């Protein structure tokens, strides 16, 4: 698993866990 | 370099900045150098071109004006007429002016 | 179902007066039919071909001449010098490696109402006892090169429009005075006039075009 597409995975789970924690802001 | 040429003339010679003082130095007949700004009132210029010949002086349409001619004549304030009476150690008499 | 070749009438080309065989060629026209005439049905054409043929000079293996059809008389079209071309096969030929290429372009008008844009290529050559496997110009030298290149072109243009210009165009008298300036600086090889094209004429005045056609 190349880190180019893996930095993209964490990237999606980043906007993801920032909006879920920002849901209960 | 017309820049440093008048640097010495103000650093030695007798110069007069301003319509009155310059037309007053011309009405006395002891200035042989008048530098006009190609942006200042041509009404003002028109008479100074007419005095140029009346006071036998070599005019010179300066590539500048108040904050151009004034910039090099080392003074924070504005001026467009540098009517030189007698130069110091610079021969702006026989040059490209 | 008519096979329109039966329609199209055959033509014949006739160069100005400063060309070898004025009878440049035989082509096709258009028989007068529905909502169309003949003499004023073409003209908006050209005449590009091997200049060596239209000049009968086999030494001009390359180079080409461009002619715009003007007025026709007696089904014998009297073409006019529309300009000059350069076989792409010779452009690449003169472009050798380890040297510098110099293409020039400038505009110039004639004293007898007319405008065109002539060219003049140039290339860097070696020395009598050259050693380096390169040999390029000094750039600022390339500037003095192109400086007098366009300079000289527009110095002999004034006179008899492109009629007298072609009288020095194909004979390559250009290279002679152009090579004179290039000598005191960098030798260079070739140095021709490449191509060129017209853009402004006085009008459709074949009265002036009578000097070549007679």
């Amino acid at each position: 698993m190349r880190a180019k597409w893996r930095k993209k995975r964490t990237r999606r789970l980043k906007r993801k866990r920032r909006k879920v924690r920002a849901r209960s802001k | 370099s017309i820049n440093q040429k008048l640097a010495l003339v103000i650093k030695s010679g007798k110069y007069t900045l301003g319509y009155k003082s310059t037309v007053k130095s011309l009405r006395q007949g002891k200035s042989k150098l008048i530098i006009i700004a190609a942006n200042t009132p041509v009404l003002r210029k028109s008479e100074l071109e007419y005095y140029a010949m009346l006071s036998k002086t070599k005019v010179y349409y300066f590539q500048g004006g108040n904050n151009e001619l004034g910039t090099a004549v080392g003074k924070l304030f504005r001026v467009g007429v540098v009517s030189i009476l007698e130069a110091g150690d610079s021969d702006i008499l026989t040059t490209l002016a | 179902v008519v096979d329109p070749f039966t329609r199209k009438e055959w033509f014949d080309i006739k160069a100005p007066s400063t060309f070898e065989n004025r009878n440049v060629g035989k082509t096709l026209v258009n028989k007068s039919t529905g909502l169309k005439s003949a003499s004023d049905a073409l003209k908006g054409r050209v005449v590009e071909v091997c200049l060596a043929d239209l000049q009968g000079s086999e030494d001009h293996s390359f180079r080409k001449i461009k002619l715009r059809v003007d007025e026709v008389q007696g089904k014998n079209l009297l073409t006019n010098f529309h300009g000059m071309d350069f076989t792409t096969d010779k452009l690449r030929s003169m472009v050798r490696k380890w040297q510098t290429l110099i293409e020039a372009n400038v505009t110039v008008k004639t004293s007898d109402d007319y405008v065109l844009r002539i060219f003049a290529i140039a290339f860097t050559r070696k020395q009598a006892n050259q050693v380096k496997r390169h040999s390029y110009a000094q750039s600022s030298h390339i500037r003095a090169i192109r400086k007098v290149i366009s300079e000289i072109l527009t110095k002999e243009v004034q006179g008899s429009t492109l009629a007298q210009l072609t009288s020095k165009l194909i004979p390559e008298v250009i290279n002679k005075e152009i090579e004179n300036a290039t000598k005191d600086i960098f030798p260079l090889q070739n140095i021709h006039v490449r191509k060129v094209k017209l853009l402004k004429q006085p009008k459709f005045d074949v009265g002036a075009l009578m000097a070549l056609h007679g």
């Binding site: - | - | 086999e58 293996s61 076989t87 096969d89 690449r92 030929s93 472009v95 490696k97």
Partner: protein, 97 residues
């Protein structure tokens, strides 16, 4: 590890070039990483060359040449063009003939 001096292909003295499009699968590869060749061949084949001059006009004429340039992408320049993964030692080797 690194197996060439100029990294992969000639790149020393500057910082960036200008990539030219491959003449095969259009792959954009730097002008310094471009394997060129001048195929300035004729338009005649390998048989009708004399049949041309024969069924032709003009005293042999002169015959034309098409000076072309062949840029390559390396990947497709190996699936054909001159290369064939050279020997280890002669990797440094270079030759015009």
């Amino acid at each position: 590890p690194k197996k060439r001096a100029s990294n992969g292909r000639n790149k020393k003295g500057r910082g960036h070039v200008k990539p030219v499009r491959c003449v095969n699968c259009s792959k954009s590869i730097p002008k310094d990483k471009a394997i060129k060749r001048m195929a300035i061949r004729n338009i005649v084949e390998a048989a009708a060359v004399r049949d041309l001059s024969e069924a032709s006009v003009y005293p042999e004429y002169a015959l034309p040449k098409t000076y072309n340039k062949l840029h390559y992408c390396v990947s497709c320049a190996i699936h054909a063009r001159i290369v064939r993964v050279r020997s280890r030692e002669d990797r440094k080797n270079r030759a015009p003939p």
